[PDB]
Design a protein around this ligand. Structure first.
Ligand SMILES: O=c1ccn([C@H]2C[C@H](O)[C@@H](COP(=O)(O)NP(=O)(O)OP(=O)(O)O)O2)c(=O)[nH]1
Ligand SMILES: O=c1ccn([C@H]2C[C@H](O)[C@@H](COP(=O)(O)NP(=O)(O)OP(=O)(O)O)O2)c(=O)[nH]1
Ligand SMILES: O=c1ccn([C@H]2C[C@H](O)[C@@H](COP(=O)(O)NP(=O)(O)OP(=O)(O)O)O2)c(=O)[nH]1
Ligand SMILES: [Mg+2]
Ligand SMILES: [Mg+2]
Ligand SMILES: [Mg+2]
Ligand SMILES: [Mg+2]
Lengths: 140, 141, 140
């Protein structure tokens, strides 16, 4: 029930790395050289139709993160998006990062969400947390 | 099921959906900010929100700002029970300063459905095929 | 319904900071000194078994983010993972960041997800958004 179409011969069908993996691994359709502390938008050359009740989160893989300081920016693929799915890769490492066509460089998660109507009110109910934020619960 | 919000000042803007089925409500800065290269700022929305039960509000980055200006969103977990001013923690990872003006959509808010499970310690867990596989265990390509 | 086991004497059972906090706070099992612009994989020394229908997202705490420019990389703990839960911490601040054993340095969110079957199709339906992305809706 996750539907995709290839936009070029360079796309690879996403794959799940394990039986209960949260993500479908996304493959680069092209080579990219990302200098240290730089970014690139990596084309997958796929369009997707997400199942009703979710959006597609482009999320980072752990190996690339831990090994090479690679992160994923942006990442919110909308249910109504019909364009090329682009992975916004951040290279926070000291080294340049090579992406080759067919490298799995991010993963796609079908994050379940509500599409709530927004409503303005004058006052919200109170809660126990209240305005507590930004470390209000402490360090340890 | 509604997302309720209240303006904490006249400088707040009602969040808006960018497209009919956009996962997020765009969040507007209530203030001007000049964010230096490789620095962060907590952008005040001057709204408080009441999330529908069984979700939290994820402050997520917009893709244009990410792809074009190396802007990212830190933190981002707005709890169901938060009634404070919603802050967007913006990271400017670019080499140039980033300008936020009051009224700019600088992030989006997603109603992420979650569980609130009770936590239970056990002697050991069931085994799986993945097992202790992680950090690239499945390969590069 | 979120089961965990301690992998060592140095782990701490995850705790919620408020009644309806999205995250279970994760505690470091070790001391780390993370220099500026560096990363570390902080070991929790716990294994977890997430409830069916979610994955465990390691998310950053706002206190650490706003005060110290601490961010969380990777973060996708899969339902089938039985290894040591690692927190990929990125220190983007000017100062080194000290993690002490027992510090709450991230949180784990039980994000509800679909595990869809993937299906390749010829083409997808048209939407109003279409291929609009990357700021197509404007700045303000
Ligand atoms: O990582 C991403 C993020 C977004 N996108 C595409 C799909 C998404 O539906 C579209 C818009 O995403 P966002 O709303 O998160 N970004 P922004 O608000 O800047 O774009 P827009 O003005 O079009 O809504 O951009 C990608 O291809 N990769
Ligand atoms: O991006 C954010 C993240 C959090 N917050 C606020 C709302 C949230 O409910 C509250 C607590 O967030 P976190 O639990 O993610 N951070 P931390 O654990 O540091 O704060 P606390 O100790 O108060 O729980 O801080 C923001 O305003 N913007
Ligand atoms: O922050 C993280 C991310 C992942 N992990 C572990 C748990 C997760 O189930 C496993 C694999 O996560 P990802 O699939 O997100 N990363 P990657 O694809 O690089 O690893 P693998 O090849 O094993 O699937 O690594 C952590 O402990 N901490
Ligand atoms: Mg994986
Ligand atoms: Mg948008
Ligand atoms: Mg980041
Ligand atoms: Mg907290």
């Amino acid at each position: 029930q996750l539907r995709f179409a290839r936009l070029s011969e360079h796309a690879t069908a996403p794959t799940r790395g394990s039986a209960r993996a949260a993500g479908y691994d996304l493959y680069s359709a092209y080579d990219y050289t990302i200098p240290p502390m730089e970014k690139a938008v990596v084309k997958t050359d796929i369009q997707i139709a997400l199942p009703s009740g979710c959006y597609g989160r482009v999320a980072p893989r752990s190996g690339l993160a831990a090994k090479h300081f690679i992160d994923v920016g942006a990442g919110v693929i909308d249910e109504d998006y019909r364009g090329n799915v682009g992975v916004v890769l951040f290279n926070f490492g000291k080294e340049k990062f090579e992406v080759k066509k067919g490298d799995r460089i991010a993963q796609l998660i079908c994050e379940r969400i509500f599409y709530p109507e927004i409503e303005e009110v004058q006052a919200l109910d109170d809660t126990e947390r209240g305005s507590g934020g930004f470390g209000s619960t402490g360090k340890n």
